[PDB]
Amino acid sequence: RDLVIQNEYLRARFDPNTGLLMELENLLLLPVRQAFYWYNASTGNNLSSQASGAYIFRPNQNKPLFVSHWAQTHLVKASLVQEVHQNFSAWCSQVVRLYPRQRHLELEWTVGPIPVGDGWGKEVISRFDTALATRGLFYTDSNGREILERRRNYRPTWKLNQTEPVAGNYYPVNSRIYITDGNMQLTVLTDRSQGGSSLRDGSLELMVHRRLLKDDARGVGEPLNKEGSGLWVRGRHLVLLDKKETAAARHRLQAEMEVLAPQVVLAQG
Amino acid sequence: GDSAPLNEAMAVLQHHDAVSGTSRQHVANDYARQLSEGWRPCEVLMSNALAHLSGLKEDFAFCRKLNISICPLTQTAERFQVIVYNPLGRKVDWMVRLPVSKHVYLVKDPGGKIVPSDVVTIPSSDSQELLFSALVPAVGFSIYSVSQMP
Amino acid sequence: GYKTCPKVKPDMLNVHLVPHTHDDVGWLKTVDQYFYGIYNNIQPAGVQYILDSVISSLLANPTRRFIYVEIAFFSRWWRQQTNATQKIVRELVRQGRLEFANGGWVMNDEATTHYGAIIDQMTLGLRFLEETFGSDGRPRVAWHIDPFGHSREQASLFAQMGFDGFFFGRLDYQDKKVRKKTLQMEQVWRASTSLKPPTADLFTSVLPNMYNPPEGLCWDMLCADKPVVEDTRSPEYNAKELVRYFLKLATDQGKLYRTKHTVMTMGSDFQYENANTWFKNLDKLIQLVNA
Amino acid sequence: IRVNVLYSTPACYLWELNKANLSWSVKKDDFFPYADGPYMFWTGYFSSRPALKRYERLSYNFLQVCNQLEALAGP
Amino acid sequence: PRTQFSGLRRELPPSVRLLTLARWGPETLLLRLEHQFAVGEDSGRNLSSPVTLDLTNLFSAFTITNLRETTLAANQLLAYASRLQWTTDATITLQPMEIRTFLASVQW
Ligand SMILES: *[C@H]1O[C@H](CO)[C@@H](O[C@@H]2O[C@H](CO)[C@@H](O[C@@H]3O[C@H](CO[C@H]4O[C@H](CO[C@H]5O[C@H](CO)[C@@H](O)[C@H](O)[C@@H]5O[C@H]5O[C@H](CO)[C@@H](O)[C@H](O)[C@@H]5O)[C@@H](O)[C@H](O[C@H]5O[C@H](CO)[C@@H](O)[C@H](O)[C@@H]5O)[C@@H]4O)[C@@H](O)[C@H](O[C@H]4O[C@H](CO)[C@@H](O)[C@H](O)[C@@H]4O[C@H]4O[C@H](CO)[C@@H](O)[C@H](O)[C@@H]4O)[C@@H]3O)[C@H](O)[C@H]2NC(C)=O)[C@H](O)[C@H]1NC(C)=O
Ligand SMILES: *[C@@H]1O[C@H](CO)[C@@H](O[C@@H]2O[C@H](CO)[C@@H](O)[C@H](O)[C@H]2NC(C)=O)[C@H](O)[C@H]1NC(C)=O
Ligand SMILES: *[C@@H]1O[C@H](CO)[C@@H](O[C@@H]2O[C@H](CO)[C@@H](O)[C@H](O)[C@H]2NC(C)=O)[C@H](O)[C@H]1NC(C)=O
Ligand SMILES: *[C@@H]1O[C@H](CO)[C@@H](O[C@H]2O[C@H](CO)[C@@H](O)[C@H](O)[C@H]2NC(C)=O)[C@H](O)[C@H]1NC(C)=O
Ligand SMILES: *[C@@H]1O[C@H](CO)[C@@H](O)[C@H](O)[C@H]1NC(C)=O
Ligand SMILES: [Zn+2]
Known part of the structure; x- marks a missing residue:
């Protein structure tokens, strides 16, 4: 008996030993894992004085660390919603939802005040992992319109000498991003522009938040530090699963329902 | 009711040092400030619009x-x-x-x-x-x- | 517009000096602090002075040209002027002594902006110019010199707005290296995989030194480069060496571009505060080298 | 070789490039990622300042609704 | 006294998007209509195919009396505009990803 939430179009499973999303399915089944990892921001080394900062993204380690290997889940099954609350940490938690007749799975993440007390700048990411063979390719939307194909460590225009395996593979994602094995597609919609890329195959990742304590020598003259009310942020990610040939119409139409959403105004009476 | 103030602030935030978050903290605060102040005249406009379209008597919020x-x-x-x-x-x-x-x-x-x-x-x-x-x-x-x- | 362009000297290498001022609508100071010139300690910059000078310097020599880009700053300054000044300036634009480059309310970013928001922003700038100067104040080229990388959609948007060209400064260092070696600094950018050509075909040109003067020819009040000294009996005389430097500098650059033409962006972040420091010397420069 | 320098605008320089009637190569991709030198990429601002980034994309949705309503009502 | 409103008499077909509906002036609205699908995203429902629309009565809140084609930023009259060429070596119809801008005089 595993932790499950569903509605008319989708069914999500959670891994019994971890509390993390384990399987998503169309009532197309897809073993997908999601979790929050962080990048140990770089302040420089013998290879170059450069350090991560307001502009520049430079990890002093190419492999991110788990914000936590498991999450404390709390099931809430209501007449109108079905959500799995997840608690990864004091500064990280998420709510996974499925509403009435909605084609996507809602992932509302809250990356609280990132602890910089360890004296290490950090850059958080939500990374989805899968087995669907993507051959280093993945897609991103350009300012929310046409979609450009992206390849790990590759340049259409010249013969690239990669200097940062993680950094040089990040592209702007303003609305969406997706990875398909040519047969089934997993797409992620955002509520704001973020960074992202497919670092290992069958995987994906967007950057939720970052906090560096050292300027990156490009002009600002101050570390992306002390943002105040902004230290604590909450956003949503809309997960979409469909066959490659049917994906397009869904991410287009929902993506538009996402930016041109409904407005609510109240009146006493 | 004026939509001009918000249209203008949305333009400002389109700068390359604004939404990109590549400006100093005080400029990042004044950016949000210009936006906050553009939201008021707009909901004023939105109240009149609705009152007119629905006839409803109550003060919206x-x-x-x-x-x-x-x-x-x-x-x-x-x-x-x-x-x-x-x-x-x-x-x-x-x-x-x-x-x-x-x-x-x-x-x-x-x-x-x-x-x-x-x-x-x-x-x-x-x-x-x-x-x-x-x-x-x-x-x-x-x-x-x-x-x-x- | 184009019917107002200068006289090129065919069968010679032509260097187009493009005087300008990159005015960030906020970065290290706020918009009001930048416009008024408040807290010059944080950063010396006051756009209201920059605009006054440019105009004077333009009336000082009809040869001089100036391109201004941030409409949000100009828009303000404008309402602040007298009918007299406004009548004058409109004539400088009519005969193209004052030209507008991007036309947007600001020079928007290309990685985090929403295509729809970029349009409202542009329409807003182009709207002001439109009803203030008419056809005569409509930009012809797009001017992104500082954004950090460029999106294909941006090119598509500008193409659809009727811009003929688009120039920029920041591109990957490896990409640049190859382009200069492959004489490919300029080409045509097909920004759409949907729209039918020429609809989304925007001409693109990669500027030389990002957007700053060549090393040694920065005459703003912010640089300290040695100014032009012609007095032949004066020890500070450098007019001769100056020209020797330039000529070599120009023919070196020519080799990087396909036509007998190349640009030289004369100005940087918030320059022309005192527009005259720039023009006085530039005037001599043009005369001494064409001589 | 000979040299002629002159005052000019980005538009006039473009008019000359057109006048030459050449044939240029074609670009079909974006210019991301931007990198002004080894080990340094300008890919961190893609997510810098989440809060503000969201505040703006939200004000957009809002201004729109504001616009549409001003259009439907006829003051 | 008016629980529910709508501004259209017949809604937009899925492949289209109301980009902008605005007050350009006293008796003038700014309208933009884009085709939110790029070639290939048909997704089995010919959603990428071109679409033809009627603008007379699309809207109920007001009536369109005059219309005039425009460039994306609305600063030139599309029919009176032109761009330099480059050698590389009512009813409005929309093609994939095409955005058309209009300034229409109206009456409420
Ligand atoms: C979920 O969605 C959210 C979006 O919906 C999202 O973003 C957040 O959105 C909310 C609203 O939705 C935003 O809230 C607004 O923020 C505005 C900006 O606040 C900041 O800037 C103010 C001004 O800053 C300048 O001036 C200060 C002094 O006056 C200086 O200290 C600053 O350094 C800065 O100075 C610079 O600029 C000056 C010119 O302005 C210049 O002279 C100077 O030299 C220099 O260059 C600050 O006052 C404000 O500080 C407050 O809050 C911080 C918390 O960080 C405290 O530390 C401070 O002590 C102080 O309390 C911020 O720095 C606000 O202005 C705006 O306030 C108004 O509206 C709210 C409600 O919306 C009212 O409660 C409030 O009373 C204000 O109304 C006042 O003004 C109106 C008109 O504006 C007027 O009618 C009324 O009388 C009244 O006087 C509001 O708070 C918020 O900014 C967004 N956050 C972020 C990070 O972007 C949010 O992230 C999402 N949440 C999630 C997912 O977690
Ligand atoms: C997730 O669980 C953690 C437990 O580690 C919660 O954080 C603790 O909350 C208690 C009381 O609220 C505090 O006394 C502890 O100091 C907190 N832990 C820390 C910061 O060390 C946290 O509130 C939960 N987050 C959720 C579910 O929102
Ligand atoms: C890939 O990038 C590296 C660094 O930019 C290049 O190697 C460096 O080259 C410089 C001189 O050209 C040496 O002084 C450094 O020691 C090299 N870095 C190291 C530690 O290897 C390299 O040339 C690039 N790839 C190629 C061969 O084009
Ligand atoms: C994250 O980076 C830090 C900083 O490099 C790593 O620890 C380092 O910092 C210490 C002081 O803050 C130095 O004294 C150590 O020499 C240095 N460690 C190394 C690389 O030798 C820290 O281990 C990293 N965190 C993790 C767990 O990845
Ligand atoms: C220009 O200034 C004069 C004052 O000399 C003023 O009367 C006039 O109205 C101004 N321009 C306009 C609005 O016609
Ligand atoms: Zn700049």
Whole structure:
């Protein structure tokens, strides 16, 4: 008996030993894992004085660390919603939802005040992992319109000498991003522009938040530090699963329902 | 009611040192400030627009903090309305989620018929939200009515 | 517009000096602090002075040209002027002594902006110019010199707005290296995989030194480069060496571009505060080298 | 070789490039990622300042609704 | 007294998007209509195919009396505009990803 939430179009499973999303399915089944990892921001080394900062993204380690290997889940099954609350940490938690007749799975993440007390700048990411063979390719939307194909460590225009395996593979994602094995597609919609890329195959990742304590020598003259009310942020990610040939119409139409959403105004009476 | 101030602030934030977040903290604060001040004249415009389009007599109000489960009106009033506007060129069947007090609420749609509702609880904060489906026409709006049962 | 362009000297290498001022609508100071010139300690910059000077310097020599880009700053300054000044300036634009480059309310970013928001922003700038100067104040080229990388959609948007060209400064260092070696600094950018050509075909040109003067020819009040000294009996005389430097500098650059033409962006972040420091010397420069 | 320098605008320089009637190569991709030198990429601002980034994309949705309503009402 | 409104008499087909509906002036609105699908995203429902629309009565809130084609930023009259060429070596119809801008005089 595993932790499950569903509605008319989708069914999500959670891994019994971890509390993390384990399987998503169309009532197309897809073993997908999601979790929050962080990048140990770089302040420089013998290879170059450069350090991560307001502009520049430079990890002093190419492999991110788990914000936590498991999450404390709390099931809430209501007449109108079905959500799995997840608690990864004091500064990280998420709510996974499925509403009435909605084609996507809602992932509302809250990356609280990132602890910089360890004296290490950090850059958080939500990374989805899968087995669907993507051959280093993945897609991103350009300012929310046409979609450009992206390849790990590759340049259409010249013969690239990669200097940062993680950094040089990040592209702007303003609305969406997706990875398909040519047969089934997993797409992620955002509520704001973020960074992202497919670092290992069958995987994906967007950057939720970052906090560096050292300027990156490009002009600002101050570390992306002390943002105040902004230290604590909450956003949503809309997960979409469909066959490659049917994906397009869904991410287009929902993506538009996402930016041109409904407005609510109240009146006493 | 003026939409000019907000259109202007949205332009400013389009700068390359603004939304990119590549400006200093005080400039990042003044950016948000210009935006906050553009939201007022707009909801003024939105009030007149609706009052005109629906004839409704009540003074409208906006809930800017739904963002974190906070709205004085929906957590205090015993009788109030929800006007949901839809900007899309097609109909929407969207879920409403407002913060309420520990009571039971009855929801009636545009026609007056009782629509399914449900008060859900927010884990760990022990506060709750009223929920229901709001069917809205393209480029239009719908007005539902709510009342906490005694 | 184009019917107002200068006289090129065919069968010679032509260097187009493009005087300008990159005015960030906020970065290290706020918009009001930048416009008024408040807290010059944080950063010396006051756009209201920059605009006054440019105009004077333009009336000082009809040969001089100036391109201004941030409409949000110009828009303000404008309402602040007298009918007299406004009548004058409109004539400088009519005969193209004052030209507008991007036309947007600001020079927007290309990685985090929403295509729809970029349009409202542009329409807003182009709207002001439109009803203030008419056809005569409409930009012809797009001017992104500082954004950090460029999106294909941006090119598509500008193409659809009727811009003929688009120039920029920041591109990957490896990409640049190859382009200069492959004489490919300029080409045509097909920004759409949907729209039918020429609809989304925007001409693109990669500027030389990002957007700053060549090393040694920065005459703003912010640089300290040695100014032009002609007095032949004066020890500070450098007019001769100056020209020797330039000529070599120009023919070096020519080799990087396909036509007998190349640009030289004369100005940087918030320059021309005192527009005259720039023009006085530039005037001599043009005369001494064409001599 | 000979040299002629002159005052000019980005538009006039473009008019000359057109007048030459050449044939240029074609670009079909974006210019991301930007990198002004080894080990340094300008890919961190893609997510810098989440809060503000969201505040703006939200004000957009809002201004729109504001626009549409001003259009439907006829003051 | 008016529980529900709509501004359209017939809604937009899925492949189209109301980009802008605005107040350009006293009796003048700014309208933009884009085709939110790029070639290939048909997704089995010919959603990428071109679409033809009627603008007379699309809207109920007001009536369109005059219309005039425009460039994306609305600063030139599309029919009176032109761009330099480059050698590389009512009823409005929309093609994939095409955005058309209009300034229409109206009456409420
Ligand atoms: C969920 O969604 C959210 C979006 O919906 C999202 O973003 C957040 O959105 C909310 C609203 O939705 C935003 O809230 C608004 O923020 C505005 C900006 O606040 C900041 O800037 C103010 C001004 O800053 C300048 O001036 C200060 C002094 O006056 C200086 O200290 C600053 O350094 C800065 O100075 C610079 O600029 C000066 C010119 O302005 C210049 O002279 C000077 O030299 C220099 O260059 C600050 O006052 C403000 O500080 C407050 O809050 C911080 C918390 O960080 C405290 O530390 C401070 O003590 C102080 O309390 C911020 O720095 C606000 O202005 C705006 O306030 C108004 O509106 C709210 C409600 O919306 C009212 O409660 C409030 O009373 C204000 O109304 C006042 O003004 C109006 C008109 O504006 C007027 O009618 C009324 O009388 C009244 O006087 C509001 O708070 C918020 O900014 C967004 N956050 C972020 C990070 O972007 C949010 O992230 C999402 N949440 C999630 C997912 O977690
Ligand atoms: C997730 O669980 C953690 C438990 O580690 C919660 O954080 C602790 O909360 C208690 C009381 O609220 C505090 O006294 C502890 O100091 C907190 N842990 C820390 C910061 O060390 C956290 O509130 C939960 N997050 C959720 C579910 O939102
Ligand atoms: C890939 O990038 C590296 C660094 O930019 C290049 O190697 C460096 O080259 C410089 C001189 O050209 C040496 O002084 C450094 O020691 C090299 N870095 C190291 C530690 O290897 C390299 O040339 C690039 N790839 C190629 C061969 O084009
Ligand atoms: C994250 O980076 C830090 C900083 O490099 C790593 O620890 C380092 O910092 C210490 C002081 O803050 C130095 O004294 C150590 O020499 C240095 N460690 C190394 C690389 O030798 C830290 O281990 C990293 N965190 C993790 C767990 O990845
Ligand atoms: C220009 O200034 C004069 C004052 O000399 C003023 O009367 C006039 O109205 C101004 N321009 C306009 C608005 O016609
Ligand atoms: Zn700049």
